[PDB]
Design a protein around this ligand. Structure first.
Ligand SMILES: CCCCCCCCCCCCCCCCCC(=O)OC[C@H](CO[C@@H]1O[C@H](CO[C@H]2O[C@H](CO)[C@H](O)[C@H](O)[C@H]2O)[C@H](O)[C@H](O)[C@H]1O)OC(=O)CCCCCCCCCCCCCCCCC
Ligand code: CLA
Ligand code: CLA
Ligand code: CLA
Ligand code: CLA
Ligand code: CLA
Ligand code: CLA
Ligand code: CLA
Ligand SMILES: CC1=C(/C=C/C(C)=C/C=C/C(C)=C/C=C/C=C(C)/C=C/C=C(C)/C=C/C2=C(C)CCCC2(C)C)C(C)(C)CCC1
Ligand SMILES: CC1=C(/C=C/C(C)=C/C=C/C(C)=C/C=C/C=C(C)/C=C/C=C(C)/C=C/C2=C(C)CCCC2(C)C)C(C)(C)CCC1
Ligand SMILES: CC1=C(C/C=C(\C)CCC[C@H](C)CCC[C@H](C)CCCC(C)C)C(=O)c2ccccc2C1=O
Lengths: 159, 733, 98, 62, 80, 34, 29, 192
């Protein structure tokens, strides 16, 4: 459809990309007995290959003129499962990491030896902050609105 | 002033050998000389400009003379597809008989070189058909170079020196440049294309002896002065026109056809004439803008001053930005270099898509050379622009006059700029490398269907908006109902849509997942290079590690080992670091272009379209595969025409590797070595009768960095020029 | 047929009307506002230039509104430009619409 | 100058601690001292020192 | 031939002159910091550019600054 | 090539003699104290 | 330059241009 | 008072006619900018007030479409008029000539005025009925502004409808509305 790519469950080049690999695996397989560890491993590999090729066609990815999936990172509603759906969860996880790290730094900074608490972590406080870091957007936006997110008296100097 | 450098005392009193080196280095820095004033400097710039023009024209005349004397231009004119253009002849007393038999190809009687500079097609297009014309051009260029030398000497005599206040007349200089040097020159070129080029393309000879006799249009100059201008676009040449003969040629001199000539696969001459006429009129009109001495015209200072938006969003606006650019030569040099380096990449990107010369795009080994040449020139120029911006900031910027204008607020928040450039470069590099390595692992484990292939939907949509009908987007120029389509339907789209929808030329080649990744690598390269250069130019006046850098100058080695270590801290060192990234970015771009076009010319575009999405494909299908005739240029079984390249190639490597010698090892080892070498020379008989004058010392620090960078760059350029010429011309696509 | 001697004279007359009558105070005030190109604080002539001198022998006029010869030249150039831009267009006939 | 144990913010443009805070130690009250105020910071500089002396007109924010 | 400079922030640490391996920097009476001492560079004709002086002054940025200038035999550190 | 005896006259006079004399002249100009 | 005298013309013109460049260089120094 | 209860900025104190306190973007923060903005708004309002009947009338009387009423170019001929009789002096070049010259003269006349009051409220030969002599005047300014802003919004609606529904005018859209109010509405171009 879009970008001149056909869906993968109709691509006549995907069939070859499957059957050639299957036949290679079977050529490897025919060097043992059907009741030996190499044969079991190879049959498992073949079943995994079939299960993989019978999922891309059902998902809705568009293959190319060479029989290979192509990702439409465009915003297309028929393809949200390629970029934006995993991208949102990644952004969630990364904001989580950053927010809990920032909060740990903020809390440690007001102590006796803050430099000591950075080579020797204090696991109770760090764990508390990691736990509380689940609702980080509702906290980051709240700190932005309340004017608590940024400083103004930065210590940069240039003569 | 009593020794080799007479423009400096510090180098004169230098007993060491360094006096020689730093005499050749600081030979063109007229500003930092002894007893320099603002009126000797400008006149020296003027005379050096005249000398440079003389050298350029002498080079061009030499090219003309050597193609006329030893070349086979006349033979090439009548068969531009089954003959090779000869650059010049070779006379090497070290040659052997097989080398003479190998390099005697073409039509020449001895051994010769083959011109990969594309001058043959250029000269043939503009209407040169005989060695006599080339010789006439050569002698005329000798004459004009002699005239430029005469003027350069003249304007240094005391009676005729211009004053420093004459140079700073920016209004009149810009007025005259814009009007004359651009518009009148384009008008003269239009006249030549109309009189000599287009008729010689139609078939009829037109030279000086019959200029006033043969008119370029059956009804010349009548319709022009009567406003009936369409008469000059009545009947153009058809698809059956043979370039050179009159077999199916029209009589129109100006038109707008678009697309390529079906035979030569290049743009229409009448189109170039019309374009030059249009831009000539545009430039002539745009000339009369600034007040010279006639009452009307602008004051280019009050224009700058008048553009402070109310609300203080960017401070005092452009108030004061006139004096800085006028008095400081480095500001003008940086602006000139940047604006020149953008268009010297524009020409590279355009000349391959729309070949402007007859029978170009069929010399598969010439277009590659032209593109690579111009892109490397553009890279060096873009680096020089930032270098001179940094020099301006160091030695020409006055923080009191530039009080709160935009130029001061750029220094006011430079940390944010450097931080965001850092973030962009890190993001691009992380993700590009991640995707490339993921595809590499996926291809390594025998499962090519699990790699992240991303279709470049934005660029494909743009191409569809230009009239391409491969992706079926049908937007704004593939749509038959869009007003943009109906507007240009009568004028040029019949040719433009025809050329762009032919998948055999370089006009908007198709793109897939392999182009996406390379474009992102190019973005990463650009971003890192500008990051280095901008960091240098901004922290050239001072940083927290060294907040007096302006007092030490542009290039200084370091500030000692103290304070943790301040090696490699100057802004010249920022430029020296950025040169590497510039070379790397240009190498990526040229690799991409050359592989794409090799695969297009061979016939299997589906090898690049499928083996570039991973990184071993670049190393095996491009570098290792296309090197089979290069290294076989000579062997224990003989040698062939590529042998020279097979030498040069290896040569490159050597020089390149030698660069490392100057970049890894530093001075304190070599000086302690020279100190015992001198002992060994002094304490030997029969060899202490001789004696050195200049005390031998190791190269300086910045000098070592400079020599290392020069070796690295020369090797990088040579081992790729050799490869791109041998792998292509050895196969011709 | 597109006759010329009347269309370009009408264009030149229209733009000369516009220059002499309706835009002359605007033009004069805008010229006086940004008077002379200035380098380092003083004009080119006073900074020293035998060639940055205005030519009053060419500017001495007598029109009650101060319509010197260079104003006539400029407004007539614009008039000829618009006149030929009109002339070249009405000779083809097209349909470049929605 | 300022009081002992007072938290002042620096204004010396070529200082590592520019726009940073520090507590005074002991300001010398001699007649001809050019930089009597002594302030110690909780972050060393590139050289490793944390104490430095300024003039009273060169640093004050409270 | 390098140019040494001593700005009026020296607290009289005397380390600059202790570190310089050429007998270039010397102490001088100058009231104003604590002990009426200051540095002084009378013998700049012998400085090689060692920058051991700058690596010792525990001042905010620095109080003794070396600027590398014209090169000679003494400043190049040559023995041949 | 019309002459064909000039390349045997010039490259020996431009790759051997020209550097041989200009290097000597420049060495005399460099190693002099005036 | 398919002729013979034309090479001599080119040579003498190059020599004149060389003398001009020599004078210019002397003036620049 | 565009938001009951909300305060006003330091420059929107409600003295001016038609002033309610609408400035969320903070455009009139600068005095001379506000002084120019008031006159520009008055000019736009008067032009839109003139334009609205000029589009609503000829579609029902002269049978135009206000976008085909300008289509007669690029094709020699056209130049329809009120009864439909062709205007013989309506050739595009010689009509654009005077359309340029007259408006240029009028604007270059209006531009020459130092008084802002006389700038946005000229009077004299522009009030040849004594409507603003000494009677209720601020009320007249308020009526003028309240009609002008409505006319501006109406013309913006004109220009967006003529684009969403090509080849038609803003009067057949009323008949489309009253043909099925619950199916023919903006929810078609917004939500396709
Ligand atoms: C086109 C080439 C044509 C053919 C050329 C072939 C000729 C062979 C080359 C000769 C090179 C000589 C050796 C290298 C130069 C010596 C290095 C050096 O002393 O280096 C140091 C120099 C001199 O330093 C100067 O040193 C000065 C020292 O001051 C001296 O000078 C002052 C006045 O000058 C005072 O007198 C002072 O007292 C006295 O001490 C100051 O420090 C100045 O600030 C400082 O600029 O530094 C500078 O700025 C560097 C100046 C050069 C900058 C150019 C760098 C460009 C590099 C681009 C990369 C090359 C890539 C090649 C690509 C090719 C692809 C095929
Ligand atoms: C810059 C232009 C240029 C260049 C690079 C060359 C290059 C070459 N020429 Mg040549 N030539 C030129 C212009 C040029 N020519 C012109 C204008 C003429 C007409 C007078 C000739 C006439 C000529 C003859 C007759 C012969 C050559 C030959 C050669 C080859 C051997 C070198 C030699 O003997 O030169 C000798 C050069 C001359 C006798 C004249 C020099 C021409 C101009 C004045 C030099 C340009 C100055 C230059 C720009 C400054 C360089 C600065 C640089 C050092 C930094 C070599 C490929 C020989 C050949 O074919 O061997 C195979 C040979 O026999 N040339
Ligand atoms: C009509 C009047 C006129 C003209 C023609 C010129 C022309 C020139 N002036 Mg000049 N000047 C003038 C009036 C004029 N000036 C006045 C009134 C003043 C007084 C202020 C000056 C003051 C002045 C100074 C102070 C300097 C000059 C310089 C120059 C030269 C610029 C270098 C050059 O040749 O670039 C050539 C550039 C072009 C031809 C433009 C090409 C357009 C772009 C950049 C390239 C596009 C190329 C095209 C796409 C493809 C062509 C390539 C082909 C192989 C296919 C040039 C010869 C400089 C110079 O050379 O010093 C001697 C210089 O330093 N001028
Ligand atoms: C800019 C360079 C240039 C030059 C030097 C010439 C020179 C010439 N052209 Mg020409 N031409 C040019 C550009 C140029 N042309 C272009 C760009 C076109 C395409 C439109 C033409 C189209 C053209 C035609 C169709 C004809 C010529 C002809 C001629 C010749 C006689 C001109 C004549 O009768 O005077 C013209 C009479 C005048 C009174 C002109 C003077 C006033 C002009 C407008 C001044 C220009 C403005 C000024 C610079 C300010 C002459 C050799 C004629 C001929 O017989 O050639 C063999 C001819 O029939 N040309
Ligand atoms: C139009 C081209 C152009 C011109 C006229 C100049 C001119 C100049 N450059 Mg420059 N430069 C250029 C292109 C150019 N450059 C490019 C393309 C690069 C990037 C490779 C550089 C990189 C460069 C460096 C790194 C330095 C110069 C320096 C200089 C100055 C002294 C040159 C010297 O010592 O020998 C001189 C004003 C030197 C300078 O001004 O030192 C203060 C210097 O250090 N240039
Ligand atoms: C806002 C200003 C304005 C502008 C620019 C126009 C412009 C136009 N009107 Mg129009 N009109 C306006 C206000 C305006 N009107 C007002 C306020 C009314 C209500 C009285 C009308 C009522 C009106 C009718 C009834 C007709 C036009 C027509 C026209 C067109 C033909 C012009 C012509 O030949 O007549 C100017 C010539 C001499 C004065 C032209 C596009 C005609 C048209 O487009 O036909 C399809 C047409 O029939 N107008
Ligand atoms: C709803 C329509 C409307 C209303 C109520 C007003 C109201 C007013 N206008 Mg007015 N005007 C309008 C539309 C309107 N205008 C349009 C469409 C144009 C064009 C003008 C052009 C105009 C001018 C040129 C002048 C007025 C003036 C006036 C004021 C006194 C005259 C009067 O009331 O009549 C009053 C505030 C006069 C004024 O304020 O003094 C004045 O000089 N108006
Ligand atoms: C000034 C007030 C005003 C009024 C009375 C109307 C009235 C109308 N508009 Mg409308 N419109 C207006 C302003 C106005 N518009 C403005 C300012 C805009 C720009 C955002 C639009 C943009 C707009 C669109 C995009 C559409 C309408 C449509 C309609 C019609 C559908 C009925 C409805 O729910 O509304 C109706 C005749 C719809 C229509 O014509 O369908 C019948 C439709 O598609 N309007
Ligand atoms: C540091 C410094 C400097 C330097 C800087 C630089 C060197 C810069 C560069 C920069 C650059 C080099 C930039 C560039 C830019 C570009 C651009 C900005 C572009 C744009 C474009 C456009 C706008 C386009 C558009 C379009 C399209 C897209 C399509 C269609 C057509 C058109 C045209 C519409 C100086 C000396 C100044 C000063 C001092 C300091
Ligand atoms: C005395 C008097 C008078 C009269 C006046 C007159 C009569 C005037 C006229 C005027 C005129 C009668 C003017 C004219 C002018 C012209 C001009 C100034 C021209 C120019 C042109 C141009 C510049 C062109 C250009 C071009 C070319 C060349 C080519 C093509 C393109 C173009 C077109 C662009 C009166 C009655 C009022 C009043 C009383 C007194
Ligand atoms: C080898 C080396 C030396 C010693 C190298 C010397 C002394 C250079 C001299 C080499 C010979 C004598 C000259 C070579 C000639 C060239 C082929 C061209 C000369 C220059 C032209 C202008 C003629 C250093 O001094 C040094 C300093 C800092 C970092 C790295 C190094 C380094 O690697």
């Amino acid at each position: 459809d879009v970008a001149g790519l056909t869906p993968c469950k109709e691509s006549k080049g995907f069939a070859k990309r499957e059957k050639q690999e299957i036949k290679k695996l079977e050529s490897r397989l025919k060097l043992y007995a059907p009741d030996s560890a190499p044969a079991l491993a190879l049959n498992a590999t073949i079943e995994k290959t079939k299960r993989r090729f019978a999922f891309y066609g059902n998902e809705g990815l568009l293959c190319g003129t060479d029989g290979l999936p192509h990702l439409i990172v465009d915003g297309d509603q028929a393809h949200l499962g390629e970029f934006v759906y995993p991208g949102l969860v990644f952004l969630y996880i990364a904001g989580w990491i950053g927010w809990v790290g920032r909060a740990y730094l903020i809390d440690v900074r007001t102590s006796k030896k803050p430099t000591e608490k950075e080579i020797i972590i204090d696991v109770p406080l760090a764990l508390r902050i990691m736990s509380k870091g689940l609702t980080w957007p509702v906290a980051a936006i709240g700190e932005l609105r309340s004017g608590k997110l940024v400083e103004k008296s930065a210590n940069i100097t240039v003569s | 002033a009593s020794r080799f450098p007479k423009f400096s005392r510090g180098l004169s009193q230098d007993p060491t050998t360094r006096r020689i080196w730093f005499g050749i280095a600081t030979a063109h820095d007229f500003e930092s000389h002894d007893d320099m004033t603002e009126e000797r400097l400008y006149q020296k710039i003027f005379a050096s400009h005249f000398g440079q023009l003389a050298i350029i024209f002498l080079w061009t005349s030499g090219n003309l003379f050597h193609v006329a004397w030893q070349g086979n231009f006349e033979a090439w004119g009548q068969d531009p597809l089954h003959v090779r253009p000869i650059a010049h002849a070779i006379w090497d007393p070290h040659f052997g008989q097989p080398a003479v038999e190998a390099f005697t190809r073409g039509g020449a009687s001895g051994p010769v070189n083959i011109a990969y500079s594309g001058v043959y097609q250029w000269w043939y297009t503009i209407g040169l058909r005989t060695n006599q014309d080339l010789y006439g051009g050569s002698i005329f260029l000798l004459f004009v170079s002699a005239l430029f030398l005469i003027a350069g000497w003249l304007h240094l005599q005391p009676k005729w020196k211009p004053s420093v206040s004459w140079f700073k007349n920016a209004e009149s200089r810009l007025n005259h440049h814009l009007s004359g040097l651009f518009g009148v020159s384009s008008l003269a070129w239009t006249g030549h294309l109309v009189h000599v080029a287009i008729p010689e393309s139609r078939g009829e000879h037109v030279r000086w002896n019959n200029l006033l006799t043969a008119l370029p249009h059956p009804q010349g100059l009548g319709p022009f002065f009567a406003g009936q201008w369409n008469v000059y676009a009545q009947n153009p040449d058809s698809n059956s026109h043979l370039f050179g003969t009159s077999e199916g040629a029209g009589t129109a001199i100006l038109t707008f056809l678009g697309g390529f000539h079906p035979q030569t696969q290049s743009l229409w001459l009448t189109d170039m004439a019309h374009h030059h006429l249009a831009i000539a009129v545009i430039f002539i009109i745009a000339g009369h803008m600034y007040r010279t001495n006639f009452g009307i015209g602008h004051s280019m200072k009050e224009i700058l001053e008048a553009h402070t938006p109310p609300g203080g969003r960017l401070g005092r606006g452009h108030k004061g930005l006139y004096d800085t650019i006028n008095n400081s030569l480095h500001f003008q040099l940086g602006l000139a270099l940047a604006s020149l380096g953008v268009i010297t990449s524009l020409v590279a990107q355009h000349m391959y898509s729309l070949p402007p010369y007859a029978f170009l795009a069929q010399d598969f080994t010439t277009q590659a050379a032209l593109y690579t040449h111009h892109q490397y020139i553009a890279g060096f120029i873009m680096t020089g622009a930032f270098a001179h911006g940094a020099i301006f900031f160091i030695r020409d910027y006055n923080p009191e006059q530039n009080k709160d204008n935009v130029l001061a607020r750029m220094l006011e928040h430079k940390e944010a700029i450097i931080s965001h450039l850092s973030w962009a470069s890190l993001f691009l590099g992380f993700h590009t490398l991640g995707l490339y390595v993921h595809n590499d692992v996926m291809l390594a484990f025998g499962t090519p269907e699990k790699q992240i292939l991303i279709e470049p939907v934005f660029a494909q949509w743009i191409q569809s908006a230009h009239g391409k009908a491969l992706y079926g987007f049908d937007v704004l120029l593939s749509s038959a109902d869009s007003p943009a389509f109906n507007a240009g339907q009568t004028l040029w789209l019949p040719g433009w849509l025809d050329a762009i929808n032919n998948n055999s030329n370089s006009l908007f080649l198709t793109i897939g997942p392999g182009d996406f990744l390379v474009h992102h690598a190019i973005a990463l390269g650009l971003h890192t290079t500008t990051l280095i250069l901008v960091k240098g130019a901004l922290d050239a006046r001072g940083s927290k590690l060294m907040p007096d850098k302006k007092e030490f100058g542009y290039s200084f080695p370091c500030d000692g080992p103290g304070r943790g270590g301040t090696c490699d801290i100057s802004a010249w060192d920022a430029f020296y670091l950025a040169v590497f990234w510039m070379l790397n970015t240009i190498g990526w771009v040229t690799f991409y272009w050359h592989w794409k076009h090799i695969t297009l010319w061979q016939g299997n575009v589906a090898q690049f379209n499928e083996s570039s999405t991973y990184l071993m494909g670049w190393l095996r299908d491009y570098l290792w595969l296309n090197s089979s005739q290069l290294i076989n240029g000579y062997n224990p079984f003989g040698m062939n025409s590529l042998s020279v390249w097979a030498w040069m190639f290896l040569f490159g490597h050597l020089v390149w590797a030698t660069g490392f010698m100057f970049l890894i090892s530093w001075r304190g080892y070599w000086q302690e070595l020279i100190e015992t070498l001198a002992w060994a020379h002094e304490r030997t008989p029969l060899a202490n009768l001789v004696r050195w004058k200049d005390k031998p010392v190791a190269l300086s620090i910045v000098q070592a960095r400079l020599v290392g960078l020069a070796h690295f760059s020369v090797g990088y350029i040579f081992t790729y020029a050799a490869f791109l010429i041998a792998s292509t011309s050895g196969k011709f696509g | 047929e597109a006759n010329t001697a009347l269309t370009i004279t009408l264009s030149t007359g229209a733009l000369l009307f516009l220059g002499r009558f309706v835009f002359l105070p605007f033009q004069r005030d805008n010229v006086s506002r940004q008077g002379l190109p200035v380098q380092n604080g003083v004009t080119h002539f006073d900074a020293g230039d035998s060639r940055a001198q205005e030519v009053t022998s060419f500017l001495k006029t007598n029109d009650p509104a101060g319509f010197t010869i260079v104003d006539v030249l400029a407004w007539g150039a614009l008039g000829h430009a618009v006149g030929f831009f009109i002339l070249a267009t009405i000779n083809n006939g097209y349909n470049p619409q929605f | 100058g300022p009081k002992r144990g007072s938290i002042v913010k620096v204004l010396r443009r070529e200082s590592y601690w520019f726009n940073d805070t520090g507590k005074v130690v002991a300001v010398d009250q001699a007649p001809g001292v050019r930089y009597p105020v002594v302030v110690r910071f909780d972050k060393v500089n590139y050289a490793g020192v944390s104490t430095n002396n300024y003039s009273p007109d060169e640093l004050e924010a409270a | 031939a390098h140019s040494v400079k001593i700005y009026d922030t020296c607290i009289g640490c005397t380390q600059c002159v202790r570190a310089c391996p050429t007998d270039v920097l010397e102490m001088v009476p100058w009231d104003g910091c604590k002990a009426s001492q200051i540095a002084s560079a009378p013998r700049t004709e012998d400085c090689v550019g060692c920058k051991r002086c700058e690596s010792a002054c525990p001042t905010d940025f620095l109080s003794v600054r070396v600027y590398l200038g014209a090169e000679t035999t003494r400043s190049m550190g040559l023995a041949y | 090539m019309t002459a064909s005896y000039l390349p045997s006259i010039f490259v020996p006079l431009i790759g051997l003699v020209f550097p041989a004399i200009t290097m000597a002249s420049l060495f005399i100009y460099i190693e002099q104290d005036e | 330059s398919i002729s013979d005298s034309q090479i001599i013309v080119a040579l003498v013109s190059a020599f004149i241009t060389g003398i001009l460049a020599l004078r210019l260089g002397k003036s620049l120094y | 008072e565009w938001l009951p209860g909300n305060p006003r900025p330091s420059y929107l104190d409600g003295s001016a006619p038609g002033d309610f306190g609408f400035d969320p973007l903070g455009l009139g923060e600068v005095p001379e900018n506000l002084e120019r903005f008031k006159e520009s708004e008055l000019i736009h309002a008067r032009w839109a007030m003139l334009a609205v009947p000029g589009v609503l009338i000829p579609e029902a009387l002269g049978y135009g479409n206000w976008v085909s009423a300008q289509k007669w170019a690029a094709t020699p001929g056209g130049q329809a008029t009120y009864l439909g009789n062709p205007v013989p002096w309506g050739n595009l070049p010689v009509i654009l000539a005077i359309e340029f010259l007259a408006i240029a003269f009028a604007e270059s006349q209006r531009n020459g005025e130092p008084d802002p009051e006389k700038r946005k409220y000229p009077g004299g030969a522009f009030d040849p009925l004594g409507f603003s002599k000494g009677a209720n005047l601020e009320e007249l300014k308020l009526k003028e502004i309240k009609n002008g802003r409505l006319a501006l919004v109406a013309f913006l609606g004109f220009a967006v409808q003529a684009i969403a529904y090509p080849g038609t005018g803003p009067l057949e859209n009323l008949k489309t509305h009253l043909a099925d109010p619950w199916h023919n509405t903006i929810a078609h171009v917004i939500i396709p």
